[PDB]
């Protein structure tokens, strides 16, 4: 994967561009909001080697947090603004893409 530096720390990986999963939120309305806005959300995740964690939840938390930090930084310079709903939705889709990444790392091991 590509090596990356985020927030002045290296050792991150940037995954491939992924097919973002459709997420369900428990209302048709929010589902359709997601479909209409998902292009604004990440489709690539930042992660660290599996060996830097003792458990999956910590791997995935870092991947969610840093991805959304980096995305928010780079997109705010191009004029983006995210609402509370956007942030919640990004946390869910990025969490699924980070779990997929964890599975890929765990099968490689």
């Amino acid at each position, epitope marked *: 994967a590509a090596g990356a530096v985020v927030g002045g*720390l290296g050792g991150y990986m940037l995954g491939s561009a992924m097919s973002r999963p459709i997420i369900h939120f428990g209302s048709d309305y929010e589902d359709r909001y997601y479909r209409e806005n998902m292009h604004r959300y990440p489709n690539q995740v930042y992660y660290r080697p599996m060996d830097e964690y003792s458990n999956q939840n910590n791997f995935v938390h870092d991947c969610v947090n840093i991805t959304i930090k980096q995305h928010t930084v780079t997109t705010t310079t191009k004029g983006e603004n995210f609402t509370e709903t956007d942030v919640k939705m990004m946390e869910r889709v990025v969490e699924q893409m980070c779990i997929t990444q964890y599975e890929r790392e765990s099968q490689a091991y």
Partner: nanobody
Amino acid sequence: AVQLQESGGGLVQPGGSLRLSCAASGRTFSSYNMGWFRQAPGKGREFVASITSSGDKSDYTDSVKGRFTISRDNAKNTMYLQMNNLKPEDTATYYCARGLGIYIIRARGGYDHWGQGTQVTVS
């Protein structure tokens, strides 16, 4: 070279309480995020909790959330870990560390300046 020293370890009964301290030498304590990790024999060094430079945000591994509390005294070059409701699975050497970069993370690669550790044994 900033150095960090853990203290406060010991033998504690299940359900009991201990407070660890991390003291830093130097004059840049408040400029850096900080964290606590733990290592038991047969396991690697794993995330426990972290706190930003200012104290504005903290983070915990899931197994300690609600039981342990990280804090820092920026005027005294000291970080603390209050550990409540201790369990046998919490037995480990506890290490404090200084954050790398501007973001607190859970990865072992996100910190350096490791102390020599303090041993916590929960009967």
